[PDB]
Every structure is written in C-alpha cells, then in structure tokens.
Amino acid sequence: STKNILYAVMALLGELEDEDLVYVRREIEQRIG
Amino acid sequence: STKNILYAVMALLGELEDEDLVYVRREIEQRIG
Amino acid sequence: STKNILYAVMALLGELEDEDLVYVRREIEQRI
Amino acid sequence: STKNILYAVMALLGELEDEDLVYVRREIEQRIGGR
Ligand SMILES: [Ca+2]
C-alpha cells in the first residue's frame, strides 16, 4: 500500500535531522525534479 | 546517529510512486525551506 | 520520539509476507 | 519489494529498546500467530 508506506515514511521523516533531509530531497529530485 | 532512520526512509522511497514523493518534498520544505 | 518509530514499524509489518514476519520474529526473540 | 521493506524494518528495530520490541512481537502474533 502506497498510502500505508507514505504514512510510515512521514512518521520517520520527523526523526531525521536537517542534514538527513538533504539526501532524501536529492533522491526525490532525481526522480521527479 | 540517525543513520538507521535515514537508511529506512531512503529504502522506502523506492516503494512509493512519483506522485507520492511530492508530499515528502512538502514536509522537507516545511522544515528547511 | 521512539514511539513514532514504533508506530512506523507496526505499519510496515502490514506490508511484509508471512515469511518475512518470521524473520523479524526470530530477531526479536534473539534480543529479548 | 518485500525484502526491501524487511531490511528497512530490521534497521529500525535497532532504534527500539527491548521494552518496545514486546509490542512488535505482539503485533506479529496477531498476524502469524501459530504459523
Ligand atoms: Ca506537515
């Protein structure tokens, strides 16, 4: 379920530090700009 | 370190569709601009 | 919080096949 | 991939204390108890 996985990802994002979000953002940008 | 959480998030992005990544991006922008 | 991580884990268990849940169960058993 | 998610979950178990793993174990019993 993409809805279920997205919910889990959202919960986990809040446990990441600002520096970690750089890498998440980069992965997103490589997929959808 | 946050490396376990970052690993899990990065792994799970591969289970999400392109349209789902937009929501992750919004949550990142909410925090770091 | 650690609680937020726990709830993410619980949600992800619903994505796993029975055989992968056995693997998780075994790791938990060896820890506790 | 189910194995992809499995290894994500395994990494996250390292962020949990033994006390928290009890709830994970109980959830697993709801899903594959007796199997
Ligand atoms: Ca938000």
Author numbering:
A (entry chain B), B (entry chain A): 212 to 244
C (entry chain C): 212 to 243
D (entry chain D): 212 to 246
Manuscript text:
CFAP410 is a bimodular protein comprising two folded domains, i.e. NTD and CTD, which are connected through a variable unstructured loop.
The CTD truncations that finally generated well-diffracting crystals were fragments covering residues 256–295, 212–246 and 213–246 of H. sapiens, T. brucei and C. reinhardtii CFAP410 proteins, respectively. CrCFAP410-CTD was crystallized in a condition containing 0.02 M CaCl2, 0.1 M sodium acetate (pH 5.0) and 30% (v/v) 2-methyl-2,4-pentanediol at 4°C. Those of HsCFAP410-CTD and CrCFAP410-CTD were determined subsequently by molecular replacement using the crystal structure of TbCFAP410-CTD as a search template. To find out whether and how these highly conserved Leu and Ala residues contribute to the formation of the tetramer, we first examined the wild-type and mutants A219E and L224P of CrCFAP410-CTD using the static light scattering (SLS) method. Our data demonstrated that the wild-type protein formed a tetramer as revealed in the crystal structure, but mutant A219E became a dimer.
